[PDB]
Amino acid sequence: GAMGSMERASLIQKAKLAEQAERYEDMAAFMKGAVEKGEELSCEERNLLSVAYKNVVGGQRAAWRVLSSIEQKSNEEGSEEKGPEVREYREKVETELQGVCDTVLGLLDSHLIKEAGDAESRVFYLKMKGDYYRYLAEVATGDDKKRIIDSARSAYQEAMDISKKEMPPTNPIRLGLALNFSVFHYEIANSPEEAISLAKTTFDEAMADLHTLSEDSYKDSTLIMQLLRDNLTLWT
Amino acid sequence: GAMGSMERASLIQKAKLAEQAERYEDMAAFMKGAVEKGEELSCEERNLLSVAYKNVVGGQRAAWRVLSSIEQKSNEEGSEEKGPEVREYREKVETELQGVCDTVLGLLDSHLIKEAGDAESRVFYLKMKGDYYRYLAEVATGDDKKRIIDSARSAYQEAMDISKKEMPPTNPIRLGLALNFSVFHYEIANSPEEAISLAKTTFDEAMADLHTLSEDSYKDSTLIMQLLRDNLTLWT
Amino acid sequence: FPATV
Amino acid sequence: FPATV
Numbered sequence: 001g002a003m004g005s006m007e008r009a010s011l012i013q014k015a016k017l018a019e020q021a022e023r024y025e026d027m028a029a030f031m032k033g034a035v036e037k038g039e040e041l042s043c044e045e046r047n048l049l050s051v052a053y054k055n056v057v058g059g060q061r062a063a064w065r066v067l068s069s070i071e072q073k074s075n076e077e078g079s080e081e082k083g084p085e086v087r088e089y090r091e092k093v094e095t096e097l098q099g100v101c102d103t104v105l106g107l108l109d110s111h112l113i114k115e116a117g118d119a120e121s122r123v124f125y126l127k128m129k130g131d132y133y134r135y136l137a138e139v140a141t142g143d144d145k146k147r148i149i150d151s152a153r154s155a156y157q158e159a160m161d162i163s164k165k166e167m168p169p170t171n172p173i174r175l176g177l178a179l180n181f182s183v184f185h186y187e188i189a190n191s192p193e194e195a196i197s198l199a200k201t202t203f204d205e206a207m208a209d210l211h212t213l214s215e216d217s218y219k220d221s222t223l224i225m226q227l228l229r230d231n232l233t234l235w236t
Numbered sequence: 237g238a239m240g241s242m243e244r245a246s247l248i249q250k251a252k253l254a255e256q257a258e259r260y261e262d263m264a265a266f267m268k269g270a271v272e273k274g275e276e277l278s279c280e281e282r283n284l285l286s287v288a289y290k291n292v293v294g295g296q297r298a299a300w301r302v303l304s305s306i307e308q309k310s311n312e313e314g315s316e317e318k319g320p321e322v323r324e325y326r327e328k329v330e331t332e333l334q335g336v337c338d339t340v341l342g343l344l345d346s347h348l349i350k351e352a353g354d355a356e357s358r359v360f361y362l363k364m365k366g367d368y369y370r371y372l373a374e375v376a377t378g379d380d381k382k383r384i385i386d387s388a389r390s391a392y393q394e395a396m397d398i399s400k401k402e403m404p405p406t407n408p409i410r411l412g413l414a415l416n417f418s419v420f421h422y423e424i425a426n427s428p429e430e431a432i433s434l435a436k437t438t439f440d441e442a443m444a445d446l447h448t449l450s451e452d453s454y455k456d457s458t459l460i461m462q463l464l465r466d467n468l469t470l471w472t
Numbered sequence: 473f474p475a476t477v
Numbered sequence: 478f479p480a481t482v
């Protein structure tokens with residue numbers, strides 16, 4: 001690994017600098033190096049890792065969607081043939097995206113998940129596993145599409161089961177997991193009713209537990225609750 | 237070159253797709269491949285090349301400035317010592333930036349400029365040469381800083397001399413050249429009076445020639461004239 | 473597109 | 478920062 005010679009602490013410091021500079025490819029590379037040191041990640045460090053890869057893959061997903069749209073339009077009646085270029089370039093972006101997903105999934109499997117015993121860490125990583133399988137599912141069209149979808153479902157389900165047992169209904173990790181699993185149901189699993197049920201039940205159970213919270217925890221929880229409401233509004 | 241196997245036309249097509257996808261690194265790589273085919277570039281193609289590299293280097297300059305600011309703050313009285321990391325990462329970004337500048341300058345020298353005989357093409361490339369020497373100058377701190385500044389000045393001056401002889405005062409290339417040379421004077425050459433004079437004279441001579449233009453050419457010219465006015469406002 | 477975090 | 482094109 002190109003980061004093998006750099007101190008763990010220096011990699012974390014640089015990941016923070018890269019975030020300030022909006023250099024998310026750099027940030028992800030730094031965080032990958034930090035994970036490969038083999039020590040567990042603190043909460044702050046887990047969030048650096050997630051921010052970096054979310055921003056890299058987010059950009060790739062947006063580009064993929066632009067290119068897929070152009071490709072779809074090229075295959076409509078009356079569209080002039082323009083050769084293989086659109087498909088080729090969509091494939092290029094797709095392959096890069098799959099590579100990033102495989103990299104993240106690799107870090108999780110070697111060996112973040114297996115060393116994560118606390119609910120907060122384990123749920124966080126399992127949510128990530130679901131998320132990156134979901135990104136793979138978005139672009140999957142072949143023999144393995146069902147298995148990819150099932151891998152996302154399985155990771156999310158394990159995370160949900162732990163979160164319900166071990167975390168309060170206002171915990172931001174529990175909320176963001178439910179938010180994203182709900183989107184999985186709506187966008188990937190062709191289960192809009194499940195998506196809506198999950199988002200509603202999550203919102204309502206969080207609402208009932210807000211009274212237990214400090215001002216700052218209330219801020220954190222209500223932010224994600226609003227995202228649940230935003231999706232419900234989009235879907236109903 | 238990794239693009240050596242791809243058709244010129246396919247590289248241009250893909251550069252356009254990459255622009256739509258906001259994939260400017262890809263766009264620049266495609267355009268570099270197209271230039272390396274060895275044929276001259278059309279107007280549209282020259283603009284694809286400039287857009288791509290402007291966006292790549294623009295991002296690097298913004299990141300460099302964030303990191304340089306943090307580094308400067310670290311060297312103030314009372315600042316706690318945090319080790320070499322800030323300098324290292326600023327250096328990393330700097331080196332990548334210099335590499336992009338050298339790549340562009342390389343394309344211009346091998347062999348875009350020497351084959352460009354029409355005023356519109358020659359001025360466009362010489363403006364680019366000035367611009368990328370100016371980006372090098374922004375980060376230069378050593379033995380060659382003066383020569384780098386002089387290289388920018390010389391390229392801009394040649395472009396100005398051709399533009400004044402061969403193009404009307406409202407030509408968008410002539411205007412954008414003057415805009416950028418004016419910024420060179422203000423930000424790089426420590427010549428704010430020259431910057432202001434140039435921007436004013438350029439604006440006023442353009443104003444006097446607007447009457448000759450179509451609606452669409454008027455739109456194009458007045459846009460850049462407004463940038464001249466914006467800088468004048470910032471500087472006075 | 474729906475919100476995720 | 479000043480405008481360039």
Ligand SMILES: *CC(=O)NCC1CCN(C(=O)[C@]2(Oc3ccc(Cl)cc3)CC[C@@H](N)CC2)CC1
Nearest residue numbers: 042043044046047127172173174176177220477
């Ligand atoms: C270690 C730990 O507690 N990590 C989670 C923490 C929760 C607060 N938080 C957020 O609310 C934002 O991002 C999330 C990321 C992941 C998850 Cl599972 C939930 C929320 C931070 C940015 C904000 N604009 C959206 C929510 C940061 C991470």
Ligand SMILES: *CC(=O)NCC1CCN(C(=O)[C@]2(Oc3ccc(Cl)cc3)CC[C@@H](N)CC2)CC1
Nearest residue numbers: 278279280282283363408409410412413456482
């Ligand atoms: C071949 C040719 O004519 N190229 C120049 C052409 C002029 C119009 N134009 C613009 O005005 C914008 O960008 C410029 C780039 C370079 C120069 Cl020298 C001048 C202008 C296009 C985007 C706009 N928001 C700013 C001006 C495109 C290029």
Ligand SMILES: [Mg+2]
Nearest residue numbers: 006007008009
């Ligand atoms: Mg060590």
Ligand SMILES: [Mg+2]
Nearest residue numbers: 091094095139
């Ligand atoms: Mg594929």
Ligand SMILES: [Mg+2]
Nearest residue numbers: 194197198201
């Ligand atoms: Mg249920």
Ligand SMILES: [Mg+2]
Nearest residue numbers: 242243244245
């Ligand atoms: Mg050919």
Ligand SMILES: [Mg+2]
Nearest residue numbers: 327330331375
């Ligand atoms: Mg240096």
Ligand SMILES: [Mg+2]
Nearest residue numbers: 430433434437
């Ligand atoms: Mg003069």
